[PDB]
Amino acid sequence: MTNFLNGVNIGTPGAYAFYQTTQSRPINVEPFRTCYMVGFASNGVNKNVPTRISNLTDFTNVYGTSASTNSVDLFFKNSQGFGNLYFVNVAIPTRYQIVVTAATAGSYSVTVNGVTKAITVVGGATTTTIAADVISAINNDTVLNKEVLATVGGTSSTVVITSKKPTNTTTAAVTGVIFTLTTTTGTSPSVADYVYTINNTFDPALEAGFVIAPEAFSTFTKSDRLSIQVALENLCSAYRYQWAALIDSGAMSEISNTDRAIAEAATYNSVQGHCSYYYPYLINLDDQQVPPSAAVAGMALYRFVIDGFAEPPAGVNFPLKGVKNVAYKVTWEEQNVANPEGVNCILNKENYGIVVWGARTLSADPNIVFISTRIILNIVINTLNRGYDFDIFNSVGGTATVLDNIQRKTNTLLTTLYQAGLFYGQTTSEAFSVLGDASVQVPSLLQQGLVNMFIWVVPSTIIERLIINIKQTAIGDLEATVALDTAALQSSVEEGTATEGTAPV
Amino acid sequence: MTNFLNGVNIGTPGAYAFYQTTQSRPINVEPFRTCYMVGFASNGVNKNVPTRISNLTDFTNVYGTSASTNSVDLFFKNSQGFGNLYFVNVAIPTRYQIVVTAATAGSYSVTVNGVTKAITVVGGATTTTIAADVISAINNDTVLNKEVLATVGGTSSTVVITSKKPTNTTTAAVTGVIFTLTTTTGTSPSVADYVYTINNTFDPALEAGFVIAPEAFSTFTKSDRLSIQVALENLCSAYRYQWAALIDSGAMSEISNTDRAIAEAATYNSVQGHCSYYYPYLINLDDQQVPPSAAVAGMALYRFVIDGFAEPPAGVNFPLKGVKNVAYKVTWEEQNVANPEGVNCILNKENYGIVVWGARTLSADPNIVFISTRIILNIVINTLNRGYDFDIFNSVGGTATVLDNIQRKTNTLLTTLYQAGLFYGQTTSEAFSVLGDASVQVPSLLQQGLVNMFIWVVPSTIIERLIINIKQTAIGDLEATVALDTAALQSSVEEGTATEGTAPV
Amino acid sequence: TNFLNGVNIGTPGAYAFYQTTQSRPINVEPFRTCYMVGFASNGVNKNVPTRISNLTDFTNVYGTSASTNSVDLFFKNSQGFGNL
Amino acid sequence: AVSKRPFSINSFAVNLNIGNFVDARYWSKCSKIEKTYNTGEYSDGQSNIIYTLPGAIKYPEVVLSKAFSPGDEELINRLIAVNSDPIAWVTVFIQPMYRDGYYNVPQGGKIILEFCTVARATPINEIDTIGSNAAMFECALNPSRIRSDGGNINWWSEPAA
């Protein structure tokens, strides 16, 4: 990029001086430093096609107007140039309305997606019969029935063709006076369109990372938000992806309190904790409400770059930027009730700023409670996938060295991760174990092309709450009491009765 | 060859420098590192003659303008000189138009390829009768009836003689005032011409290799494409060839999506899996759409030379060259549905380039699912044929020693392939077996000159999909869980219950 | 389980599942089995010795019976190293 | 699965360059070729395990031997004079090859021990009027580098960049 090409278009052999501009620092291509924002823009320039965005100016230039502009601005503010953002514009299915004016006898044609269908009209026919014939032909064609859907319009003499693949462009044409063609298309997206985009637009070859639909969550109603959350859960937990989703509460005008937020989170379900709920909307510098997902994702990527991937997106040393307040002040009691329900709160802590004060998922399984564990597992899975993509399509010869080599590749791949520090153990023998040799390979599965690998990992944990127990000794009773108390505490912790008993209120 | 003959034309003794020019790596005669492209050029320089092509410049010079130029360029770009290309130019049969301008009485002659048929014209005769008599004579002549075919022209007084052997030149002449002769020849080849070239031009002696017809598959309609695929199947599956064919889809405008591709590949049939269907067209550096078969064949030969012949033409390693994008983006669900049916997709994998992500054939047989298996079988067959070519026409005395010699030769020939790594087995006893001695020869077949010999082989296999099964272990209890699970898994595998059960959907 | 996760998949990709209890097989040796004679209202296997994979399988096949606690204790104390 | 037989101990041909002289005489015996790393022991403080820190690469001495025959006087003179010139160096050329007799099929480039200095020249290993062994001219060299060149295998390449 810049700062190196200044002298290329110089002919004379002298020495010259230029001024250092901002240098674009390359973002690494490691699994989990990407965010995918699903949004809408009237100019569907890249619809159902993830496109990388370099800055808010680029976003505005490409997609013009969109309710996701504030979210993109927050994401870039909080990421500070780290991590990548990919925008996915939702495609509105095309629609074509065909009106059958009269039942004139003759030969006509209806062409859909370049496939032409003849229509012979005999005397005594009706426009309703002609519409029925058109619908039957389109819905019976083996290709058109898959590509589009033909239905009855507002009248018996009207046919509606709806594109069933919004990603691809649908073309229509007619030959015949009695047919009247109109190009209709909703000017706004629907929850069904969002669901299709989520479920059919992402490629496992893409970089893993966070997925956010702040526009959809802010605009849609309860059931539509539930549908979007279900789609995101299925996507992230799909065996292909193993990604993470950051769910935002609905508009605060509806979800005006932490109890409503808790009800929404309770309705939301994520067995493996792939979805994480964040509630307080952020009031940006222009006094505009924004869902917190974009800011959370940007801060998460910055945290991954700075303090490593084992750290969750929370804490007082990574306050959000581009905001000046929250849209609702979460009380300590409300948080004490909500955090165990998986509702991660955002607090306008004084002397620190706006800080995320929760790192929990929406899972009931105690082993995946924190989002850090989910992110660690996702990183492991994606690293292994991108490693093994090199070994896919390799010959399993008579040596069968392949399977053994693949098991040894895992060993080294997971060691690289252990050195990164994603596991709980002083040594790799405490951190992870692998099993992928020929001893666990079935000849029939090998003939089919299937190879099985088994991995065990121990993710690291975090510090959620810290207890301080204090005692006031007498004048000159230091270590005349300390030692006594200590011995008892150490003995209880070693024997195993420290935890056993009842938990104080 | 260049870099060695620089000094041949010098007389004065001395040391002379000539700037090391481009080099050539002699492509060895292995029975598969060749590709045969069937195309068309306006100037039939080598009508129905497989002619080797040194490079794109040589192709352009010999054949001039042709729709196969892009395919040839991509083939060479992706082959990097490790593999030969043989172009076969489709000959258009010559047609001769005869018109009986009048029914004037007199004896006249019509000469076709040196055979003169004489027709007597008498009073009361008509041009219709004259043409009918000429047609009858030509079609009943024992030589002309198989050399050419005569048909009625645009009028009852018009006749058209079409060559039945395009390779052999057809010469026509007439002696008679009523007879007027003109030379018709379609400037564009027909599906019948392509079929004849496929089914009557190739040679078993020609080194085994891939067969492609990108121009035909891109410029023909559905029925013609199906007919050409049938001809390719017959050629590659014929007992004298045993080759492999690569099929491209129709032009993207017709085959606009993977559903249409599945449909096309379903209409296509290949019992023994000699044919491999590919779909996404490659956009070359000039933004021209090109069938992928040429690039796929080039990459296949390159990968055969680098990683050996047991590997399939796919994988992130060995990505395609001379291209910058695909004509259509295949979704993961589309591929998940199409790959089982035999559609090998091509994907613009970011961070890897354009990669073929499929190695299946069109066969329904589970044994020959993979093009790698098909290629291994073809290589074995063709190597054995080349080896036995020397033993052909040898005598057979009472010693019957030639039979033992053939068996020993087969053993060494298969040992060479086993060293190459084409079989699944740690030893030859696990890889292959032979039976060709006198114990299976029959005196009647020996008198007829027929010798039978039987081969058993175990072709290698590939890694088509890798499964990662991971468990999230709690802190500290990693080793016990690993021991328990590993014991269970190994016990199940060794007992044979690892596969029995109900497969998850 | 753990081996058939990929049979019903078409795409050639690397992708992950989560490990499950892979019951370990019991070899055919004398004294690896317990035969429990009980009664169930549903005579599904009247006087027919039938193997039991686990307590849920027993409950599904035979429904309510007074031997449920015995079955549960047997499986708890056998830990999969035995047939019932 | 023995695709190709390994190199035997007799499967190498050894030649020398001595300064500007291209000596045309083959050596029948040579010692081991290596790249040794001198080591260092350290710890960071979290464990009582000792680790090894490679350093100070060294290419140990190479001892060549051959039958002491006529025409060896010029080789002796070149060897004993080369060290006199600070610019002169000794280069050793080892071509691996498969030979059944005088016939050989070389494969790959040749290992080149570059910038070697003479540490010992022993034209006569011993004298014994009753002995029957062949006199062995020995020569000890101290290589400073190793590379490969003149073939399509490149046995010894370096981590240059």
Count how many pairs of residues, chain B against chain C, have C-beta atoms within 8 Å. Answer: 81
Mutation for A interface: B221, B337, B478, most A CBs within 10 A = B478
Q: Can you count the helices (H) and strands (E) in chain B?
A: 15, 23
User: Residues with Cβ < 8 Å from B293, sequence gap 6 or more?
Assistant: B71, B210, B212, B213, B214, B217, B246, B247, B248, B278
Phi and psi torsions of A444, nearest 5°: -65, -45
User: Residues with Cβ < 8 Å from A106, sequence gap 6 or more?
Assistant: A120, A121, A176
CA pair distance B199, B174, nearest whole angstrom: 33
Which long-range contacts does C28-33 make (Cβ < 8 Å, 24+ apart)? C32/C81, C32/C82, C32/C83, C33/C82, C33/C83, C33/C84
How is residue B328 written in tokens? Answer: 């259509």
Q: Considering only CA atoms, which of A415, A413, A427 is closest in space to residue D49?
A: A427
How is residue A2 written in tokens? Answer: 């810049």
Segment (H or E) for A174: strand A172-175
**A206 close to C (CB below 8 A):** no
CA pair distance A326, A344, nearest whole angstrom: 14
**B490 close to D (CB below 8 A):** no
CA pair distance B111, B5, nearest whole angstrom: 53
CA pair distance B331, A479, nearest whole angstrom: 70
Among left, alpha and beta (phi > 0; psi -120 to 50; other), residue D45 is left
- Rg (C-alpha) for chain B, rounded Å, is 29
Among left, alpha and beta (phi > 0; psi -120 to 50; other), residue B139 is alpha
Alpha-carbon torsion A334, A338, A339, A345, what sign?
Answer: negative
CA dist A454 → A270, A460, B299 (Å)? 24, 20, 33
Mutation for C interface: B344, B465, B489, most C CBs within 10 A = B465
Residue at A387: amino acid letter: G
Within 13 A of A95's CA, how many CA atoms are on the CB side? Answer: 12
How is residue A332 written in tokens? Answer: 């300590």
Mutation for D interface: B419, B424, B430, B460, most D CBs within 10 A = B419
Chain B contact set for D1 (CB, 8 A): 419, 426-427
Instruction: Flag if A452 and C2 touch (Cβ within 8 Å).
Output: yes
Helix or strand or coil: residue B182?
strand
CA pair distance A231, D47, nearest whole angstrom: 49
What is the signed CA dihedral for A52, A58, A62, A66, rounded to 10 degrees? 90
Segment (H or E) for A443: helix A443-448
**B254 close to A (CB below 8 A):** yes
Return residues 480-499 of B near C (CB < 8 Å). 485, 487-489, 491-492, 495, 497-499
Residues A254 and A327: beta-carbon distance below 8 Å: no
Chain A contact set for B280 (CB, 8 A): none
Helix or strand or coil: residue A39?
strand
Segment (H or E) for A385: helix A371-388
The DSSP symbol for B438 reads G
Q: Considering only CA atoms, which of A286, A246, A284, A282 is closest in space to residue A265?
A: A246
Residues B320 and B75: beta-carbon distance below 8 Å: no
**A399 close to B (CB below 8 A):** yes
Instruction: Flag if B466 and A453 touch (Cβ within 8 Å).
Output: yes
Q: Which residue of A has its CA nearest to C5?
A: A452
Report resolution in angstroms. 3.3
Mutation for B interface: A393, A405, A418, most B CBs within 10 A = A393
CA pair distance D115, D88, nearest whole angstrom: 9
Across the interface, of B471, B487, B489, the residue whose CB is closest to C18 is B471
Return the bridge partners of A172, or none.
A112
CA pair distance C59, C68, nearest whole angstrom: 8
Could you write out the DSSP letters of every residue in A215-233? HHHHHS-HHHHHHHHHHHH
Give the per-residue SS3 of chain D: CCCCCCCCCCCEEEEEEECCEEEEEEECEECCCCCEEECCEECCCCCCCCEECCEEEECCCEEEEEECCCCHHHHHHHHHHHCCCCCCCEEEEEEEEEECCCCEEECCCEEEEEEEEEEEEECCCCCCCCCCCCCEEEEEEECCEEEEECCCCCCCCCCCC
Residue at A69: amino acid letter: T
- Rg (C-alpha) for chain A, rounded Å, is 29
Q: How many CB atoms lie within 10 A of CB B157?
A: 21
Q: Considering only CA atoms, which of A366, A438, A429 is closest in space to residue A404?
A: A438
The residue written with tokens 């058939």 in the block is C4
Across the interface, of C3, C13, C14, the residue whose CB is closest to A445 is C3
Across the interface, of C3, C12, C17, the residue whose CB is closest to A239 is C17
Residues B410 and B436: beta-carbon distance below 8 Å: yes
Q: How many CB atoms lie within 10 A of CB B9?
A: 6
How is residue A73 written in tokens? Answer: 């601005």
CA pair distance B242, A89, nearest whole angstrom: 50
Residues C46 and C39: beta-carbon distance below 8 Å: no
Helix or strand or coil: residue B118?
strand
What is the signed CA dihedral for D142, D146, D151, D155, rounded to 10 degrees? 120
User: Residues with Cβ < 8 Å from A492, sequence gap 6 or more?
Assistant: A498
